[PDB]
Amino acid sequence: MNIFEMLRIDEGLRLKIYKDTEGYYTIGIGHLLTKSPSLNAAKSELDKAIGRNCNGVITKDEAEKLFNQDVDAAVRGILRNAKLKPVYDSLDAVRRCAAINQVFQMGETGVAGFTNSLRMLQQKRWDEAAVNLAKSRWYNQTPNRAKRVITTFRTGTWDAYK
Ligand SMILES: Cc1c(N)cccc1F
Ligand SMILES: [Cl-]
Ligand SMILES: [Cl-]
């Protein structure tokens, strides 16, 4: 198990523009295209990112290219965030994947609001952090996944990903 397999399981793979859990246009492996409700806006974004007129459709290699780039940006985002960085370096390798997962799904932002949890995770209070993490719109909106990520932070193993 690694980040890529992990995320591939949580986000799945689609070659055609689709709406994600929140209604936004996305493609590939959870690659958000835009929050606007204008599909055309989304197709433009698509083209821009792929660098070619896709007409809402892409290849597998293309999807995986976005994927790489996205995994990268995210970690990179973590590392650059002052509040994030320290927590992230205090973790073992599996838990790190869990951090990445969240940021990928929610942004530097979305996450920058889990202070209490962050702190708990930094103190290595697994069970506490996990209960904390669950008291969230995040868990309530996408429980199955959130469950997998939380079990991941709690245990430090890939059990939930089987
Ligand atoms: C999202 C996250 C968590 N949960 C813990 C440490 C760093 C980080 F970016
Ligand atoms: Cl791109
Ligand atoms: Cl879910």
UniProtKB/Swiss-Prot annotation:
**Which sites are catalytic?**
11, 20
Q: What is the effect of changing residue 117 to I?
A: 500-fold decrease in enzymatic activity
Quote the subcellular location field of this record: Host cytoplasm
- Would you say which domain of life the source belongs to? Viruses
What is the predominant subcellular site recorded for this chain? host cell
Any one cellular-component term (Gene Ontology)? host cell cytoplasm
What does the record give as the reaction this protein catalyses? Answer: Hydrolysis of (1->4)-beta-linkages between N-acetylmuramic acid and N-acetyl-D-glucosamine residues in a peptidoglycan and between N-acetyl-D-glucosamine residues in chitodextrins
The impact of changing residue 20 to E/Q is:
Loss of 99% of enzymatic activity
Q: What induces it?
A: Expressed late in the viral replication.
GO MF entry, a single one: lysozyme activity
Q: Which family does it belong to?
A: Belongs to the glycosyl hydrolase 24 family.
**HAMAP family registered for this protein in UniProt:** ENDOLYSIN_T4
Q: What does this protein do?
A: Endolysin with lysozyme activity that degrades host peptidoglycans and participates with the holin and spanin proteins in the sequential events which lead to the programmed host cell lysis releasing the mature viral particles. Once the holin has permeabilized the host cell membrane, the endolysin can reach the periplasm and break down the peptidoglycan layer.
Q: What is this protein called?
A: Endolysin
Recorded source organism is: Enterobacteria phage T4 (Bacteriophage T4)
